[PDB]
């Protein structure tokens, strides 16, 4: 048939910080215990994991902004 | 059929930071134990993992600003 | 039949950081304690995979911003 | 003077254990953390002393038992 | 003067200990932070110090039995 | 004048002991962080000192007995 599809989304957008000094910043964990019993792990298709972890994150970025955008058109 | 599409999404968008000094920043974990117990593992498709991990990032980016975008056409 | 796709994305954006001085920055870890036991390990078709892992990072980008970007278009 | 004294305790006395199998002892701390601040440590004659300790222990002796005498005669 | 001091303590005591199978015994400690902050120590005349201390002990003695005894005899 | 001190303790004493097997003994620390600031360490006459310790252990003697005795006679 006769269709017509125009798919013209727009995105002047902006994400902006501005910051002064950032620091002085301390991280200091005490240590400490995991343990984990298992007997079958079996993962199949599209599987994120995470067992037995005591991880530690330190993160300053000077701006750390995000911008996530998706487009999707399906025609059947 | 007689099918038009037109694909022209349009981004003039900005991700931006700006930042004073960045710095004076400690990150000092004080150890720990970790401890994992598996018989089987059995991983199949597109599986990630972590099993035992006593990991530690510090992680100062001057920036570390993110624009991720994704674009799908499906024609059937 | 008379199909017809045009596909002009258009992607003028920008990913953009000012800083100042960055420094100072001190990442200093504890040791620690890791263990696993497994039997089998039995992994197919993009498997990944960390097991016992004791890992420390400091990562200072100047920048560390990133752009990034997916087009699929399919036709049938 | 004509001062006598006679000084003979007796002691036949024991301390005694029996024990069967001593096992199965399991000491898993979740480690912490200890901070003290101070400006002026001033000891003198006889001290003692701990400041800031994070301090494990296991002690399984087979027997441990104590026997502590203290005999003191004095004259003036 | 014709003082006269008789000293004959007796001891025959006994300290004793019977134990089986002495084991399967586990201290696995998760690490932890300590810290101290101090401008002057000023130690003087028997003194017994321990200032920020992370210690880790296992003691297994298959005995461990103890006898102290002392003895004082003073004439002014 | 006529003073007459005689000093004749008596120790037949035993300290004793029997153990089975001793074994099995497992020792695992996590490691740790400590931290010390001092300006001055001034230090006199008898003193004993630890300072900023991670100290790990593991002692297992098959008897691990003592016996201490301290005499003392005095005239003055």
Do not use: A, M
């Not at 006769?2 to 000094?21: N, W």
């Amino acid at each position: 048939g006769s269709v017509q599809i125009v798919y013209k989304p727009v995105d002047l957008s902006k994400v902006t910080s501005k910051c002064g000094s950032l620091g002085n910043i301390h991280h200091k964990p005490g240590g400490g215990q995991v343990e984990v019993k298992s007997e079958k792990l079996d993962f199949k298709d599209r599987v994120q994991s995470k067992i037995g972890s005591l991880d530690n994150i330190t993160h300053v970025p000077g701006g750390g902004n995000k911008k996530i955008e998706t487009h999707k058109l399906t025609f059947r």
